[PDB]
Design a protein around this nucleic acid. Structure first.
Ligand code: 0KX
Ligand code: MG
Length: 378
DNA sequence: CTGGGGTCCT
DNA sequence: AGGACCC
């Protein structure tokens, strides 16, 4: 019952899209900027020392010749992302989205059909596509090895189809679960793929230097674990189950300790259509209810176009604010306005979000972030 | 000089 | 409503 999973991660996604829009940007060192942050950059700027999530001032110091493009509008990135996901859904219907640029696909059924169409004389002719992690030797008599190789071939066909149909490049990783497929996809970058045979799992899991490098272990869990002297993957592997059960609860403890061994039983979930739409806007300061009302109007209009095109009606609205630490107030959308989506649906919505806003803050302040979300879609 | 999004769990 | 995680 050993699965074959592929994880696809796009190379400098936003930068890649911006280079497609304006091929002029292809040669020069490019960075995509949101407010004071260079959120991603092309390979050239990366050679010049620019790194992801670097300060615009630090990136400009490291690279004064750097050219920046504003990427605070995720419209193009969202379109392209869902094009990638749909194309992968053409291979296997079960595709899971992670962020805008990552996709898990379960290739087990497909690999099975491909193998069952083959003849024994062709079984020795099975070859890997792309890198093999750790230069490990392929045993063509190992059925798991064969299935993983076929998975590598399917991954290659996926990347080639992404390039020929969408002009996008990315990295792929083929493994037996989602954690390992994601961990091995980034070994060779960019525009390469790597397959992980089982015998090398531990090697991969011990190539990490920080426990936060494990997907599923974030900032709070990492700092917490550090407070107990757990700093390496082997520390977490060998640590006492009961203590971290006490420190993190039973669920977090068991699951992340299983992750420390490369074990991940979670299935690939069909993402399908989005569960929510939302838009944000940060600022140095917000102190006027009129300006807050105007920003909320700006978010509302774009959200209305986005939801109108989707063809599903949201049944909950929420407002999020950040103080001088985030707070939110939501409520159902009236069926009167819900049914008539696409009339001046604006004015009542502004009234609703302004009432929630008053619940949050007293007009009778310093806000640094305003966000609006349509949730509970149908 | 720290964005703009998403998911699921409690 | 908030908090954990992901990009
Ligand atoms: N914290 C983050 C992480 C990613 N992103 C956006 C910018 C990225 O272009 C896109 C993909 O994220 P990413 O895979 O973490 N880095 P990117 O794809 O740019 O480069 P690679 O390292 O994957 O080649 O999401 C963001 O806006 N905020
Ligand atoms: Mg990427």
């Amino acid at each position: 019952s050993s699965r074959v999973i592929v994880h696809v991660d796009l190379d400098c996604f936003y930068a890649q899209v911006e280079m497609i829009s304006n091929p002029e940007l292809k040669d020069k060192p490019l960075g995509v900027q949101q407010k004071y942050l260079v959120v991603t950059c092309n390979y050239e700027a990366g050679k010049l020392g620019v790194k992801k999530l670097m300060n615009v001032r630090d990136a400009k110091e490291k690279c004064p010749q750097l050219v920046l493009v504003n990427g605070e509008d995720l419209t193009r990135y969202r379109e392209m992302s869902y094009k990638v996901t749909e194309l992968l859904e053409e291979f296997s219907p079960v595709v899971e989205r992670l962020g805008f640029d990552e996709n898990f696909v379960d290739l087990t059924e497909m690999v099975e059909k491909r193998l069952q169409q083959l003849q024994s004389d062709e079984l020795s002719a099975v070859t890997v596509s792309g890198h093999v992690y750790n230069n490990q030797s392929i045993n063509l008599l190992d059925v798991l090895h064969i299935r993983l190789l076929v998975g590598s071939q399917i991954a290659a066909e996926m990347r080639e189809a992404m390039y020929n149909q969408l002009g996008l490049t990315g990295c792929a990783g083929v493994a037996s679960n989602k954690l390992l497929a994601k961990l091995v996809s980034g070994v060779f970058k960019p525009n390469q793929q790597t397959v992980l045979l089982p015998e090398s799992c531990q090697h991969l899991i011990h190539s990490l230097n920080h426990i936060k490098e494990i997907p599923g272990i974030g900032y709070k869990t990492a700092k917490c674990l550090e407070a107990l002297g757990i700093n390496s993957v082997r520390d977490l592997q060998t640590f006492s189950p009961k203590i971290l059960e006490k420190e993190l609860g039973i669920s977090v403890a068991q699951r992340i300790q299983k992750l420390s061994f490369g074990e991940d039983n979670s299935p690939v979930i069909l993402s399908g259509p989005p569960q929510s739409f939302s838009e944000e806007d940060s600022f140095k300061k917000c102190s006027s209810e009129v300006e807050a009302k105007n920003k909320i109007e700006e978010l509302l209009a774009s959200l209305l176009n986005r939801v109108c095109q989707d063809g599903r009606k949201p049944h909950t609205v929420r407002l999020i604010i950040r103080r001088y630490g985030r707070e939110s107030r939501q409520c159902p959308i009236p069926s009167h306005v819900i049914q008539k989506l696409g009339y001046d649906v604006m004015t009542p919505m502004v009234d609703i979000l302004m009432k929630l806003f008053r619940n949050m803050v007293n007009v009778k302040f310093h806000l640094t972030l305003l966000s609006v979300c349509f949730c509970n879609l149908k």
